[PDB]
Amino acid sequence: AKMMQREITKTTVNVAKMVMVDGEVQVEQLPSETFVGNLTMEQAQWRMKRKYKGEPVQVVSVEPNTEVYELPVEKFLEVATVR
């Protein structure tokens, strides 16, 4: 009767990087990145390989979270254009 809806889904991708520290290979903790849609582990790793060409970047986890932005229909008529 009164409610509308609009869904936004984003996947938070946690990444890590091999780096040289004092002549040893160690793991840099990278800031997590967020993308639009629901990405699997394989999808995210493909994106990371696209974004960081040749870099030793590992996707370590993917976390999808979906938000449902809703507005009363009455609220929408106030701002929408008749078109």
Residue numbers in the entry: 1 to 83
Extract from the study:
In a third attempt, we further truncated the initial four residues of the C-terminal tail, resulting in the p6CΔ20 variant, which readily yielded well-formed crystals, facilitating the acquisition of high quality-diffraction data. The 3D structure of p6CΔ20 was solved at 2.3 Å resolution and revealed the presence of two p6 monomers within the asymmetric unit. Both monomers assemble in an elongated tail-to-tail manner, forming a p6 dimer with maximum dimensions of 26 × 26 × 106 Å. Consequently, the main dimerization interface (DI) results from the precise packing of the α2 helices from both protomers. Dimerization occurs via an extensive hydrophobic interface, covering ∼1000 Å2 of accessible surface area (ASA) including 15% of the total ASA of each subunit. Superimposition of the two chains of the p6CΔ20 dimer (by aligning the main folded core) revealed notable differences primarily concentrated in two regions. The first one (R1, corresponding to region ii on Figure 2A) shows a significant displacement of the β-hairpin in Monomer 1 compared to Monomer 2 (with a tilt of ∼29°), indicating substantial structural plasticity in this region, crucial for p6 oligomerization as discussed in the next section. In Monomer 2, this region is kinked and displaced ∼47° compared to Monomer 1 and constitutes another source of significant structural plasticity that defines a ‘hinge region’ [predicted by the server HINGEprot (83)], involving residues E7 and E67 from β1 and β4; respectively. Interestingly, crystal packing analysis of p6CΔ20 structure unveiled that the protein crystallized as an oligomer. In this oligomer, the p6CΔ20 dimers are the building blocks that create a chain of linked dimers in a head-to-head fashion. This arrangement results in a superhelix with six p6CΔ20 molecules per turn, measuring ∼60 Å in diameter and 230 Å in height.
The genome-organizing protein p6 of Bacillus subtilis bacteriophage φ29 plays an essential role in viral development by activating the initiation of DNA replication and participating in the early-to-late transcriptional switch. These activities require the formation of a nucleoprotein complex in which the DNA adopts a right-handed superhelix wrapping around a multimeric p6 scaffold, restraining positive supercoiling and compacting the viral genome. Additionally, p6 forms dimers that bind to DNA every 24 nucleotides and interact with the viral DNA through the minor groove. In this work, we have shown that protein p6 showcases a remarkable evolutionary design that encompasses a folded core as its foundation, upon which, two structural regions play crucial roles in dimerization and oligomerization.
